[PDB]
């Protein structure tokens, strides 16, 4: 089956919307079932708050129903990971907003 995951940068309205104009990636199930998606830096500034405005709207819509057979699952599990790009940078160290353990 196929699955299209898009991303609208700095979007705030949490609502399902056509991803035709969003940065999307179509995922066709095969041997390497771990598709990625990159989001280029996008802000009105040369540097943005590490804790402020959202990164954007993340949506993963179904493109083609997950097919199966007598001996295969009718539904599967998915995991979403996140990291920084090779051009990632952090700048000013600030106070803390939470306490770890």
């Amino acid at each position: 089956g196929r699955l299209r995951m898009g991303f609208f940068p700095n979007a705030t309205t949490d609502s399902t919307s056509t991803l035709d104009n969003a940065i999307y990636t179509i995922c066709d199930i095969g041997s390497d079932n771990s598709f990625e998606i990159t989001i280029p830096y996008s802000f009105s500034t040369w540097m943005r708050k590490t804790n402020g405005h959202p990164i954007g709207l993340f949506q993963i819509e179904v493109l083609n129903r997950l097919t199966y057979n007598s001996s295969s699952p009718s539904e599967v599990y998915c995991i979403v990971q996140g990291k920084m790009g090779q051009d990632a940078r952090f700048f000013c160290p600030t106070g803390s907003v939470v306490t770890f353990q």
């Binding site: 990636t25 041997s31 390497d32 079932n33 771990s34 598709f35 990625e36 998606i37 990159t38 280029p40 830096y41 040369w46 540097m47 790009g85 090779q86 051009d87 940078r89 952090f90 700048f91 000013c92 160290p93 600030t94 106070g95 803390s96 939470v98 306490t99 770890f100 353990q101």
Partner: protein, 192 residues
């Protein structure tokens, strides 16, 4: 040219060894590295080179102050919790808030509470009343590496104030480290 692997199609089970700086692209995009400052604020030496509050002690007598120094789960120093082992110089910043007197300060990685009863050679620097000093304690540890988490990851700090009259006060302590050697990054911490 660009391979499908660098276009997003990969396999999570083929990530080892740890540390793969693989480039990710698509039309109309490429990793763009733009700098705003003349140097990095992500480098361990720079970030940690900046102190952060630790704790405060209110003294009334000439008693001694023994405290297990540890990495913060509170300030920007928390970024250390991402590592497992540490080793290197340790900068201790002490503020002696007192009207008239002196503050003896020392540091050791020795766990024994008797090797400190005297302060012979444990670094007894003197901060006059109302003053503050920044002493850099060397890695005088008996263990090659300091698990970064331990309630005593950093060596113990000693403070025996030498007061003169009924005068009393409080000793605020904050700290940083000089050139830190961190190894074997572990999973990110949880929140309280």
């Amino acid at each position: 040219t660009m391979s499908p692997n660098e276009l997003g199609l990969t396999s999570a089970q083929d990530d080892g060894p740890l540390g793969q700086e693989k480039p990710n692209y698509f039309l109309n995009f490429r990793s763009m590295n733009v700098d705003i400052f003349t140097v990095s604020h992500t480098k361990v030496d720079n970030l940690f080179g900046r102190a952060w509050f630790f704790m405060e002690h209110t003294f009334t007598n000439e008693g001694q102050w023994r405290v297990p120094l540890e990495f913060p789960k509170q300030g920007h120093g928390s970024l250390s919790l991402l590592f497992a082992y540490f080793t290197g110089e340790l900068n201790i910043h002490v503020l002696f808030l007192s009207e008239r007197g002196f503050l003896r300060v020392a540091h050791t990685y020795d766990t024994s509470n008797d090797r400190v009863n005297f302060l012979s050679s444990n670094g007894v620097i003197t901060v006059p009343a109302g003053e503050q000093m920044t002493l850099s304690a060397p890695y005088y540890s008996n263990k090659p590496l300091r698990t970064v988490r331990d309630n005593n990851s950093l060596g113990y700090l000693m403070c025996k104030p030498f007061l003169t009259g009924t005068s009393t006060g409080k000793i605020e302590v904050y700290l940083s480290l000089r050139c830190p050697n961190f190894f074997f990054p572990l999973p990110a911490p949880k929140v309280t």
